[PDB]
Design a protein around this ligand. Sequence first.
Ligand code: HEM
Ligand SMILES: [Mg+2]
Ligand SMILES: [Mg+2]
Ligand SMILES: [Mg+2]
Length: 442
Amino acid sequence: KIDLDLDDIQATVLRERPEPYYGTHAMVRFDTAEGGRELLKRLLPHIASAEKWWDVKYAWTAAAISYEGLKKLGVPQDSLDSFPESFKVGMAGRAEHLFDVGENDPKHWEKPFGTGQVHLALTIFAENEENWQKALVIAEHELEATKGVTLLMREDFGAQPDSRNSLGYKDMISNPAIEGSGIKPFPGQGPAIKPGEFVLGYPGEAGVPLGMPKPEVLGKNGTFVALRKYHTNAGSFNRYLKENAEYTGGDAELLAAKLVGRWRSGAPLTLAPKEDDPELGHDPNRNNDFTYKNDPEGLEVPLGSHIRRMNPRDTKLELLTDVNIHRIIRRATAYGPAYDPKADSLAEDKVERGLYFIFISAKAMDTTEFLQKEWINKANFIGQGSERDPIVGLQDEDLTFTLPKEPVRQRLRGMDTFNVLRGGEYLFMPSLSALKWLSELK
Ligand code: HEM
Ligand SMILES: [Mg+2]
Ligand SMILES: [Mg+2]
Ligand SMILES: [Mg+2]
């Protein structure tokens, strides 16, 4: 059944990223309360809802608002107080619960981020360059027309060869299935998570709705967003694959597969353990149909590989854990020059490429802080001590990655931080009704 008011929920909460994809991220500041309210009234016609999210849509526009954004809009103090504390503090201010330290410390963040300047994040997704522009010109026009707001930054994304990300992996394969979305999960995508884990106003896994913003028109059919921008050091990554390829029989593509858990083509190593299977990788009805019940030792998908860290499935962990409450919906967008596998100079790390991530969840701040602190930058849950995620963890050359083989558990060292945080924000992705309410304040 459809249990979700799809016509009130923003499209981005349920729509997969288009294939191929083009778009733009835009960070906006509200100079005056009335400027903010007006921008929303002008954008609101162009914010698509999640109606028939399984159908084709050549472009849609998303909007998500920071605490500072809500404050400036004039949201009353008793409504501001109903948002979680983490959201109030903002992402930079919560760096300690995110292990955003070292290279990722907020003092190094790119300009708009981490300062409270970002009030409104606008994202345009599109499947061809023509509808990207059509929606872009519409966005730019309404911005120009709104005195009282200024566009802080703007960056285009997508147009990647074969849609691969900034390290050449097929991304956007595994996202949680939502009970009540109207669509049965792809094989191996189950189980359908209770809808209140991802949309406010609805029961979660524990049977009751999560704490949500007040009044009901502001919080219902909304959700929370963790937006993070990374810079990718593909030079360092490439040199790492070459240096350590001896440990996977000279095959650098197998080593790239062991660090993520999937070949760059998308095939998971549980379904393609010895050689790539690019047709498997491209097929949504095949590329996710697996668990780890027959791989308890990480011989196929290593325990500390990226996808297995982020979604352990039936892996035995240290402490009891309901994986269902630690899921996140991801929208990844690669930006910058396309990834090149032969490029391994030091200067390749200086090419401005990377990823934007929009992580969506009714408790997005909690789950992002949880994943960052417990499953990316530690390995106690998998019994590998201080090993950290090879793709996005804050690496130290003397930390290791354990690559299980026959009959020896090989250890690798000398990793650099391959994806460096350039900034981020905790945002609130409001319902279509809540957006209208915000535009009619005061
Ligand atoms: C920063 C650079 C990152 C890169 C290059 C990257 C890349 C990937 C790739 C290639 C996959 C496999 C494709 C797929 O399963 O859809 C994946 C899966 C996943 N990643 Fe990341 N990712 C990054 C950051 C993050 C972060 C910060 C998080 C969470 C805090 C995250 C959470 C996940 C999850 C939940 C999955 C799905 C696992 C599953 O259901 O099997 N990723 N990522
Ligand atoms: Mg949307
Ligand atoms: Mg490259
Ligand atoms: Mg960059």
